[PDB]
């Protein structure tokens with residue numbers, strides 16, 4: 001399964 | 017047409033679709049009428065594609081009227097009648113005003129990041145903005161699966177910052193269908 005923690009998800013907000 | 021992650025993007029476990037609805041309370045509502053009042057906003061396949069929609073969307077706390085956002089796995093309609101939802105149900109949480117926008121963000125990040133760990137069971141999440149409260153819901157496939165519904169309840173407690181004494185309620189969609197002093201006028 002592809003799992004992401006909240007912090008990682010938020011870190012991706014600033015990339016296209 | 018088919019949505020795929022871009023070259024360097026971070027793929028998700030599933031593609032998802034945002035939906036929006038606005039109506040008034042108490043409408044005589046068939047399947048076909050309900051489906052006409054809900055609309056697809058956009059579908060995404062990567063974390064970056066998610067943020068492209070989400071960073072440009074009105075926050076649910078800023079919506080006017082009896083309105084909802086739904087975020088469901090691609091191919092699942094946010095309706096009881098959908099094959100994925102027919103035997104299913106939802107956890108609902110009722111919130112005073114001012115809490116839904118943060119709760120919704122936490123919920124959908126947990127959902128997309130596969131924090132629930134109930135295999136294929138998650139169908140989608142809803143945030144519903146109403147007259148004097150908001151409701152956040154998460155739908156799963158099999159209402160009778162007690163291990164699954166318990167795991168979902170505990171995960172919500174883990175990922176959401178809820179006020180003390182927040183009631184969580186589980187409603188099977190089949191119970192919802194057959195559910196009926198003064199008539200409720202403002203909601």
Ligand SMILES: CN1CN([C@@H]2O[C@H](COP(=O)(O)OP(=O)(O)OP(=O)(O)O)[C@@H](O)[C@H]2O)c2nc(N)[nH]c(=O)c21
Nearest residue numbers: 039040041042043045046047050094095096097144203
């Ligand atoms: C998810 N829903 C909701 N719904 C019916 O359509 C009406 C409007 O939905 P809603 O705006 O979510 O209901 P709401 O007024 O917030 O309150 P409640 O859910 O307590 O009825 C309600 O009477 C509801 O029972 C539905 N009707 C059909 N046929 N299929 C569906 O999937 C759904």
